Design a protein around this ligand. Structure first.
Ligand SMILES: Nc1ncnc2c1ncn2[C@@H]1O[C@H](COP(=O)(O)OP(=O)(O)NP(=O)(O)O)[C@@H](O)[C@H]1O
Ligand SMILES: Nc1ncnc2c1ncn2[C@@H]1O[C@H](COP(=O)(O)OP(=O)(O)NP(=O)(O)O)[C@@H](O)[C@H]1O
Ligand SMILES: Nc1ncnc2c1ncn2[C@@H]1O[C@H](COP(=O)(O)OP(=O)(O)NP(=O)(O)O)[C@@H](O)[C@H]1O
Ligand SMILES: Nc1ncnc2c1ncn2[C@@H]1O[C@H](COP(=O)(O)OP(=O)(O)NP(=O)(O)O)[C@@H](O)[C@H]1O
Ligand SMILES: NC(=[NH2+])NCCC[C@H](N)C(=O)O
Ligand SMILES: NC(=[NH2+])NCCC[C@H](N)C(=O)O
Ligand SMILES: NC(=[NH2+])NCCC[C@H](N)C(=O)O
Ligand SMILES: NC(=[NH2+])NCCC[C@H](N)C(=O)O
Ligand SMILES: N[C@@H](CC(=O)O)C(=O)O
Ligand SMILES: N[C@@H](CC(=O)O)C(=O)O
Ligand SMILES: N[C@@H](CC(=O)O)C(=O)O
Ligand SMILES: N[C@@H](CC(=O)O)C(=O)O
Ligand SMILES: [Mg+2]
Ligand SMILES: [Mg+2]
Ligand SMILES: [Mg+2]
Ligand SMILES: [Mg+2]
Lengths: 386, 386, 380, 386
């Protein structure tokens, strides 16, 4: 039986690559995707044919990632439990998508990933796979093998002949994530030097830096006047924001599978994009529309976090968020300074702001009528209390 | 006829005190509330008598303000349109509450305030006024008089001999807000040296400062180990946070009255409390409870912003928020550095976090069944789409 | 000066037509819409000319009504305060839309309506008017004149030769509504014989009647196998449902302008459609999509009731509802009997009705239980 | 080893009792609850002993069922997917609560139930058990045994001296439900004569019957002037409403385990109470409160349906609903006629209704200002759209 493996190029997926050959004695098609992890994905591809893959595939998926996943999510203003911008959550559906596609092209019966049985990724990968190909066979080695510890895994590796080697990490164009190890103690500050994508606030420039982001119908299309494709734009903003230490979050989140987990996230580009978007929305979105959208964002966020991307509830909400987002067109101007992102200006060709309505269609005495009617039910209530 | 005027002590409220006497020929009882504006109310009170008041009352309400208004609102995690912590919003109900109390004591048929017809404050004062005493009469000189300009107003002061003197501002224990004037241009960054409560970040200490906040049953009770009363506690956090330039936001908000307005706000202590509270909630609140609470927070916020404090909807939601907040007991550790507030640690007597659930509560197969069940409907969906 | 008046042809708008000519010394263009009130609109158009209108317009708007207002609203499962199917609510935006359009074509600076200052219709008419044409001028005589009672109004009409003929009523293709007068005491049952569109349940047929309604992509397209246009379909279900006394509701509602009001509504066709729609949705909609939808429906309902039809919020929610409703394709089979509507069958081309093993269930449960056990252990 | 078995008395639980003894080499303590299923619980209690239980407990939990489970739920206006009044759903938590209680008193380490692995009841039984006693062991035979059919199960029963006997049913004081078998075809109308608790409308009296229900503080306390205890009251309304064939529903619902299923429910008393409650709320509840409440009701309904009764989300929402419900005091008058329940009147001591404001607290002029303010943002949008 052929099996398509989400191959990362590291120890575990290498061990998994042989484990699959050994255990199932199946033909293994490896798949590595470049989503901005900062790894020469082609090496991964080499190491896979080298580990025994009957075929290895690598694809530059950066643009599709930002265009078809990050952007639609940002359009919805998705924030999980107040701070998490879903860096890892949104990338998983993209990977599983290709896994299933490849499996259908290779006539492969199953797909495999090395997400552990303790996290959210296994759900994201599998819900995606089952949603796209209900008959797909899934193999999650971490839930099926006997290994107990890394000593045993290192051992097993040293065996078969797989090169071997404080916290776990997941990185992509949207963010870099840290959790586990020394991070597992909620009262322990993260260790100095851990952050990779963002410069340390204290080592951030002494002079603030201004940046402008242009949005067109809900999506960012240019930075400082330079049009940039989805991936190139997130990249650019990561560079600009990174140098200033922007986008660091430290939270104890609730995992879908039931337990709390301490995670640390750095999302420089995305964090600038989040505040810039709300800046443009502040002029282009109607009051009542904004208030409704915001009360739905959290639900959409958990859908993403839990793994329900290619799910009807999420696609339905997407219709609402996309409708609203289509009006978000304009430019936000932000000030970057030692870890902070400050909105200092915004403009829109179709801005709903009118200074003439605030400076000292509006008539003061109308306010009295407004107030009286609004107060009626309250006045009746009081009178009944007598 | 008697009129209880919410007298702040400045030009406008002085012009209004005179106006009320000439227009209604009634006794004008002035009431000035100390809520942290940084004015010596007792001075406004004597000036009120000088200006013509038949009786001037001054009351220290910082404790009532933080305890009975700011705290209940904070338990709800109230945040208007993404960034506004509602500093001015929760103060108005307190003031109105007293105007009506005094009127009832003085045998006054009416109360008066100097909020304009273009803003939200008029609604806040009046909805609480009518909600508390349905038969009360409200006079809002700004909606009734003829002054067409500032100059016309300065002249009227002189005619009656009242002391006379780029943006408007409101300051209390919770924050200091700025809007209007040069701020009316949303593309124009606020002027240097505008902020008053928070030191400017570029001028804040070079070394981060750590602060710890203890929450008992939903409310903050101590700072760095020192137990403090509500007002004293907010004060302490303003000092600490201000020194670091924390809690600065710049937004274009939607007023209840219909138009957008560019607002700038500095909420040092409140911003530290916002994040400290969530840090403690991250260990003490159940996942689902949290997700539901966050989708309701925005609604409660709009209620406070619009002026529906003493309204049955707000009081109802308050019952839910208080029920949830009751479990928020623990300590948050945050790092303050040049305008930013970072959560670096948190602990709680009844933390729901367990490292044993993440260290490498169920076994591997459990996750598989959970996944199969969760995917069932997605697979049926896909099969039907055949 | 020209004023486009929403003229229904009765005493009030006739008086209003006279009042406007003299008070504003303007030319009045009358507009009467046929939305299924069961009245000859042409008669109204003629009476308007006799009353003094410089021009009178009458349009058959039943198809536009059901297709562009009733259908989109139904796709949303809109129900105000648990019972009100919003019969009068969704109709007002339609009328005002035409008032503003006619004003545009006739070069009229203002429009007028005879909705009183204590109801919801004035808000509905004006919010839509202002929304579609921001600088339009609106005149609501009930808010501007000073008639001190009916007596004085009858007198005024008699003076102008306007013919002067226990509760207030409103009727259109969607429903017939009753409120005020003898109905103002919420403890009192409506009087017998008050109902018009529906047969009294005690007088309904002794045999039940089965009906089948087909929905295509969120909209009902046929009844008992016969394809029918929007308006014709609502009419057919009103006949079928009405004969059986279906769709009667008695509620005390909260008006947008602040007070409670006791209302009685008969919506035979819309009531059948409401249950028929959910019946088809029960096979075609996903569980989570359905649950989210139902939690948003009430907000939409209040938007319609309040008069925010041509408002961005309602338009945004409509995008969600329409997206969801597009899957509603199938047939609902209902049984009608003396006042009641019983779903009795349903089917669909893409039904989601009918894999794992009992074992998977244990895992699902263990994982779902985890946070609950932790909470318990902590409580010690 | 001791095992507390939720013993109903039928073939399945008798088989399970014997199965448990030999499979787990343990003694079984049988528990039969009287929740208005219309059976003699003492006979089941005695049959359990004959089947081999070491001890058999039988309790009349009717009053607790209505007072502590049904009323709280109704207070929330809980309705699942438009029509299900949750008759079976709210009874399960009550059963499991006692199983865990009895296990602790008897020193039993585990509990057992005969709910199948493909239904919702397993989730309801187990989630409440684990929530109340985290270390309890749960044994669900349907998910563990090797019986391969009904034929084998009958032979096993007959071999163990257990007496052996178109759709499946569940009956209790709140309703009677039917599903499976012939009912599995969603296009087929239920068979004639299926209903039990309610008379067919065709056979219901030609004379309508008026019934009045008094609500005190969110709960029904009297019927036609006669004070009745919770269980006695539900019983009375089932009798009155049942004669008129009120409360029948036919739906295809979404199960928590992932699939859809056709269910038929008859809830005479509950249906009368549902409309009676709303009738009383129409006079006693504030507009904004009601609207917020109805938007949360569905969520609470799914919690109950899924089995999250003794769960923090549910108890938090219960705080909101109970707050709101406290104001629900008055009497509702309904007319029952051939399958229907018609509200014809309502009155309340603290009714918020005043015909003082409808017949011909403000004047039409206030209405004008109200409209203008409300329309401002819509007008701005139109001008901007040009
Ligand atoms: N770039 C990729 N291409 C293909 N599959 C991937 C890729 N990245 C991750 N995966 C899949 O995800 C599983 C977990 O990946 P991994 O990079 O180990 O994340 P992690 O568990 O969050 N952190 P770490 O502790 O560093 O392993 C792997 O076993 C892969 O199957
Ligand atoms: N400390 C106070 N004690 C009593 N009444 C107050 C107090 N502060 C504000 N008010 C009331 O609020 C109205 C508006 O107050 P004001 O201080 O002018 O706020 P502002 O409109 O936000 N900004 P500005 O006037 O431009 O400084 C006043 O007329 C008072 O009636
Ligand atoms: N069919 C129609 N065509 C044009 N305008 C209409 C039409 N129906 C109603 N209107 C407008 O709506 C206002 C109120 O109409 P109306 O028929 O009096 O309803 P009502 O106030 O609910 N009940 P009633 O007690 O019968 O007056 C009228 O003054 C008209 O301006
Ligand atoms: N009154 C009760 N006392 C104790 N346990 C009960 C009681 N009622 C139900 N149970 C438990 O619930 C499981 C399922 O009960 P049951 O009455 O068979 O419901 P059902 O599955 O919906 N329908 P059916 O078996 O077709 O009549 C049983 O195996 C029992 O363990
Ligand atoms: N160190 C890591 N690899 N972290 C990955 C974090 C994933 C994040 N907790 C999520 O649920 O999406
Ligand atoms: N410049 C000022 N005085 N601003 C007061 C800001 C009040 C703030 N916009 C609010 O709605 O509460
Ligand atoms: N008797 C009448 N004319 N009733 C009109 C009812 C209108 C209904 N109350 C609404 O708000 O839409
Ligand atoms: N025929 C039966 N035994 N039905 C029990 C129905 C239970 C119902 N489906 C529920 O989810 O609560
Ligand atoms: N990637 C980690 C964490 C997660 O999936 O949430 C794991 O495999 O467990
Ligand atoms: N206090 C300001 C602003 C506001 O009330 O929103 C005014 O009186 O207009
Ligand atoms: N149509 C009625 C009722 C309403 O508008 O709600 C009126 O004009 O008053
Ligand atoms: N009681 C049935 C159905 C259900 O629980 O939903 C079963 O045991 O499967
Ligand atoms: Mg890993
Ligand atoms: Mg002012
Ligand atoms: Mg009328
Ligand atoms: Mg059974």
């Amino acid at each position: 039986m052929k099996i398509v493996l989400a191959y990362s190029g590291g120890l575990d997926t290498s061990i998994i690559l042989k484990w699959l050959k050994e255990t199932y004695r199946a033909e293994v098609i490896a798949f590595t995707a470049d989503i901005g992890q900062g790894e020469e994905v082609e090496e991964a591809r080499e190491k896979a044919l080298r580990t025994g893959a009957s075929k290895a595939i690598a694809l530059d998926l950066k643009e599709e990632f930002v265009r078809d996943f990050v952007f639609p999510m940002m359009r919805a203003g998705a924030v999980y439990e107040g701070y998490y911008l879903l860096g890892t959550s949104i990338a998983r559906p993209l990977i599983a998508k290709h896994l299933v596609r490849i499996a259908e092209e290779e006539g492969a019966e199953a797909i495999a990933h090395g997400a552990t049985g303790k996290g959210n990724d296994q759900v994201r990968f599998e819900l995606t796979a089952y949603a796209l190909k209900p008959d797909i066979k899934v193999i999650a080695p971490w839930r099926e093998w006997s290994f107990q510890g890394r000593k045993e895994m290192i051992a097993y590796a040293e065996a078969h002949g797989i090169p071997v080697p404080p916290y776990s990490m997941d990185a992509n164009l949207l963010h870099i994530s840290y959790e586990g190890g020394v991070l597992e103690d909620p009262w322990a500050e993260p260790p100095k030097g851990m952050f990779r994508m963002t410069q340390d606030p204290e080592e951030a420039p002494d002079a603030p830096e201004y940046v402008e982001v242009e949005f067109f119908e809900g999506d960012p299309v240019a930075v400082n006047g330079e049009r940039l494709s989805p991936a190139a734009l997130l990249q650019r903003l990561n560079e600009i924001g990174g140098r200033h230490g922007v986008g660091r979050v430290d939270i104890v989140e609730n995992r879908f599978v039931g337990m709390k987990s301490r995670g640390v996230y750095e999302t420089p580009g995305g964090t600038i994009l989040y505040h810039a978007r709300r800046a443009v929305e502040s002029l282009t979105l109607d009051r009542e529309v904004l208030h409704q959208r915001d009360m739905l964002s959290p639900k959409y966020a958990e859908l993403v976090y839990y793994g329900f991307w290619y799910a009807p509830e999420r696609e339905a909400l997407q219709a609402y968020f996309d409708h609203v987002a289509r009006s978000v067109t304009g430019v936000a101007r932000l000030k970057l300074y030692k870890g902070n992102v400050y909105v200092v200006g915004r403009k829109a060709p179709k801005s709903l702001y009118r200074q003439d309505l605030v400076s000292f269609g509006y008539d003061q005495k109308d306010a009295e009528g407004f107030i009286k009617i609004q107060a009626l039910r309250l006045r009746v209530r009081a009178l009944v209390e007598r």
